[PDB]
Structure formats: structure tokens, C-alpha cells
């Protein structure tokens, strides 16, 4: 497969700098133009810039230059983005993106995208979440189903990853978008629905990871 693994994100303080990086495999990286794109929370895409194979053409979004430096190291199949003079507006998901060029066809497509690395600019400190069960009841069924879940509460910054039974359980799962509370901390819930008669049939454990605070939690959700 083509793989584009980003890293280097997390919490940064206002004014400070940060270096994102991106390692590529599954294609001849040497030959391809590379791009960085970002997406602030609940907003659209914003092109940052692009670099050609030999690092001689580096084009940037003008309305914010002298701030982002793009480079690449073709021997390490790696792309870099240096951020400086950081403000809250720079808080976003940053995507490593491959640009397929084709001058004959008149063709330029952003074809493979990395998953992105999260950057938050804030002087607020990290906070791990508390994880609370949302217990199901045999007596509280609706539309032929029983619901159970986890409340992942009071964390900062985004993101948390949530899964059920180490990823083995995916049918019926909904992890909801995190909400920002008036305290300045985030909160989210993840739920599983199952056919009512299957409730006692298996164990449900929600796995909650929060990398910025190094929190890992496995919470068993017992019917109650």
C-alpha cells in the first residue's frame, strides 16, 4: 500500500515552534511532488504548500509565509513542515499529501493523504480523561436493541481514540464528536447498540487512549 505516516503534533504554546514530519512508503517518493494541507476544527481545508522532488521549487500559501518552512529528505522518504510563531488559528489537523503531476494530460491531483497529526496551540495544560460506564439494562430496550457506552469526560487537548474490545467490536458502534465544555475541557461519548436478547452474551470493554497525557484505560461496561 501507499503509506503516509505523520508525527510531531500535540500541545504547543503560543509563540512557540513545532516540527511535523511524515514518512512515506509504497511508492517512489523521490519522483513525486509533496504537499501539506490543514483543517481547523469544524472547518474547511487550507492548502499550506508544496515541494518538488529536488527541493528547488517550494511554493507556499502567500497570506501566511515567513512562518511555515517545508522541506524533504528523499533518502529517508520523508517530508517536513516547520511551524513557528504559533497562534490558536494554527490549531488543526495537518495532512501529508502526495501530488500526482502530469503535464501532458493537464492534470494535478492530490491523490494519497495521510491520516494527519493533531496540533493544538494553547497555554492550558494537559488533562487526562475520566472514563465512566453508561450501563445497559435489560429493562431499557428500544427498537429491539439495548444500548451501552462510555462517557469520556474532562480531557485536554483533543484527540482521544476509543474502541471496543480492542477493535474486535465494530457493528453498532458510534463514537460521537467531542464537545467543548464551558470549563474549557472536552467531553465525548461512545456507544454500542446490540439486539436485546444478546445482552448477556458477551463482554464489552471500551478502550480509551489519550496520547497527550499518556492515559490508557480499559473500562468494562457491566449490564446493571
Amino acid at each position: 500500500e501507499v503509506k503516509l505516516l505523520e508525527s510531531g503534533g500535540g500541545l504547543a504554546q503560543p509563540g512557540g515552534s513545532l516540527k511535523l514530519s511524515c514518512a512515506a512508503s509504497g511508492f517512489d517518493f523521490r519522483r513525486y511532488w509533496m504537499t501539506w494541507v490543514r483543517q481547523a476544527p469544524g472547518k474547511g481545508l487550507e492548502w499550506i504548500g508544496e515541494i518538488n522532488p529536488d527541493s528547488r521549487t517550494i511554493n507556499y500559501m502567500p497570506s501566511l509565509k515567513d512562518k511555515f518552512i517545508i522541506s524533504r529528505d528523499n533518502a529517508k522518504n520523508s517530508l517536513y513542515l516547520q511551524l513557528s510563531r504559533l497562534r490558536s488559528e494554527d490549531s488543526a489537523l495537518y495532512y501529508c499529501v502526495r501530488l500526482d503531476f502530469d503535464v501532458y494530460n493537464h492534470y494535478y491531483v492530490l491523490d494519497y493523504w495521510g491520516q494527519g497529526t493533531s496540533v493544538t496551540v494553547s497555554s492550558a495544560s494537559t488533562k487526562g480523561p475520566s472514563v465512566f460506564p453508561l450501563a445497559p439494562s435489560s429493562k431499557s430496550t428500544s427498537g429491539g436493541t439495548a444500548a451501552l457506552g462510555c462517557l469520556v469526560k474532562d480531557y485536554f487537548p483533543e484527540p482521544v481514540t476509543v474502541s471496543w474490545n480492542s477493535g474486535a467490536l465494530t457493528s453498532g458502534v458510534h463514537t460521537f464528536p467531542a464537545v467543548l465544555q464551558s470549563s474549557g475541557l472536552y467531553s465525548l461519548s461512545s456507544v454500542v447498540t446490540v439486539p436485546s436478547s444478546s445482552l448477556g452474551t458477551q463482554t464489552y470493554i471500551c478502550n480509551v487512549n489519550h496520547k497527550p497525557s499518556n492515559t490508557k484505560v480499559d473500562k468494562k461496561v457491566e449490564p446493571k
Partner: protein, 215 residues
Amino acid sequence: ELVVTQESALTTSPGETVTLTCRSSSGAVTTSNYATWVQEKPDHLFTGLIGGTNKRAPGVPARFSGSLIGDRAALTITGAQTEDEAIYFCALWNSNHLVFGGGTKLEIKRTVAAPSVFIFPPSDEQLKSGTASVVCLLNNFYPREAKVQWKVDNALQSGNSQESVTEQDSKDSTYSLSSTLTLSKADYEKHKVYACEVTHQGLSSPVTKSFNRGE
């Protein structure tokens, strides 16, 4: 400062043709803009669909095609499928730089579905910490519009709840919604009946789910 604009949201039925457009504030979108389209699906999964206005990318289903209509660039989906639920972004090349539009949510239409509703009392573990969250779940409904009202001992609650909705499910085309009512432990102990009341087009009258504290 070039601004690219797209429709916010469109709805289409399976098998129907739908056309997304992309306009510019500099004037007509032209071949020299090299219009590109990108599709975004949940978990931020991006796929380049169209390059150079009307060139479909390798691996991309024939169902998708790109063109110009008058002023604008256009992405046509001929025979929309449930898996086409996504956000579609167009991007115009200009001078050196590339500028994205704001994106268009594509909703796939389906028959109205009422939500299943569930209410969860706070866990004994949370109550140890001094606060109490009551969660209400609205599962697998369509269309999206849905009212949730919280009541405590029959009193309408205001400005102490938050709400969150999933993206349209790519399979059953439904939405789900989660709502949290937060109060302090002390305030939670003063009241008996906690209710979640839900109106939706698929319900002929509102559904209430409730529980009694300590029962």
C-alpha cells in the same frame, strides 16, 4: 484574495444524478484553473477524485465525472450510491497556489426512520467525584432534524446540556445523536425524575425516556 464557493449541502436519492458546483470570485472558472475534486469520508479519509477539470483519477469509479457549467466547475455523480455520503471539496489552481472551497456535504436520502431512545443515569463512580452527567441517546434516525428536551422533576432544563451528532452512516444512511445533561452531585440528589424527551418526524408524538434516582 480568491474565494472558492460551493453549495453547503445537497440531498439525493440512490440512483439519482447529483451535480456539485464550484465557483470563483475572480470571475469564470476556466481550464487554466485546473479544477480538482477531493472526497472526504469519516475518520478523515481523503480521496483525490478529479484532476484537470475532467480527468478522473486511477481507481476512481466511473460514476464520478467533472466538467464546466457556465461560470463554474462541476462534479457530477451519475447514479449516487449510499457509499457516496461524504464531504466533497473542489480546489482551483491560481498563479502558483491552490485554494480550496468550503466543501459540500452530500446526504443520501432514505425513508424516514424514528430514533431508538435511551437514557443513562450517572455512574456511581462519577458521583464519587462530585458531578453527575445524564446521557440521552438517539440512535439510527432519518432525517436529521431532532429536538431533545431535558426535564428534571418535570421542569424544563435550559443551557446545561450539550449535544453531538454523527455523520450519516454509509450503510443504513441514518444519523445518531448524543446529549449530556450536567449538574452537580448535590443538585442531582435533590431531584427524583430525570427525563429525556424527543421529537422527530418519524414519531407521531414525542417519546420520553426517564428514570427515578435511586431506583
